[PDB]
Design a binder for this molecule. Sequence first.
Ligand SMILES: CCS(=O)(=O)c1ccc(CC(=O)Nc2cc(-c3cccnc3OCc3ccc(C(=O)OC)cc3)cs2)cc1
Length: 229
Amino acid sequence: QGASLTEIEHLVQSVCKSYRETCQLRLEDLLRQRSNIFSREEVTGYQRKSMWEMWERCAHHLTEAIQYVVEFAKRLSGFMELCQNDQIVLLKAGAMEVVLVRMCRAYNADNRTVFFEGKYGGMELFRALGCSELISSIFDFSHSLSALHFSEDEIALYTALVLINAHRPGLQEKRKVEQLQYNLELAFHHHLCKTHRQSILAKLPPKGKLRSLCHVERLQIFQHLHPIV
Ligand SMILES: CCS(=O)(=O)c1ccc(CC(=O)Nc2cc(-c3cccnc3OCc3ccc(C(=O)OC)cc3)cs2)cc1
């Protein structure tokens, strides 16, 4: 806590490692499946489903996704050293925000499609849910984040910062989180300088944009954290 520049580069590689081990689906794999688009008949099949079936499916995939985000935070340096309440507060407030950012990888801007259950489909795939403005907002955010051409390492380092934020209410050890955050900010800025990507900082979604689009229940976060005691 309060790291030197050599320590900061160990922290960049570390976060990038943790991300690669918990990225769920390989970027190469997602990119290669872009040609696999749902047929008009497959779309109709999803639209005919009850909102209850669709929610169950969506909830299953989001749960799976959140689990990979939880494993990502657990592998972050200093996260496991924080108290249990801070670990829960940080994950409860940020896990869905991280899933949304990570989802930009499964998004194809050419045809405005998202990878869902094995193929790519537009927002009409979610018609049954009855929440057009919400689905629209998610595709909008993904489309804006796609335009940035966000690298795997840029995502790893930015999502570490979405999670490790000392401004979350309910933090008991606020100063421990701040130290972690300051080291990750510098690790992010330093990596952007090494890769000549300083330009993306002004292009990133602003303060509150990720928060307005989005909190997980305290028990469902502890569940992902400690699945066996
Ligand atoms: C992530 C890491 S990855 O490895 O890139 C990877 C990427 C994809 C997959 C496949 C997959 O799961 N696709 C999925 C897509 C969607 C989805 C997409 C767009 C709009 N809506 C969607 O769902 C509806 C919905 C309803 C309420 C909320 C909410 O809470 O409102 C804020 C959020 C979403 C859900 S699941 C696996 C791994």
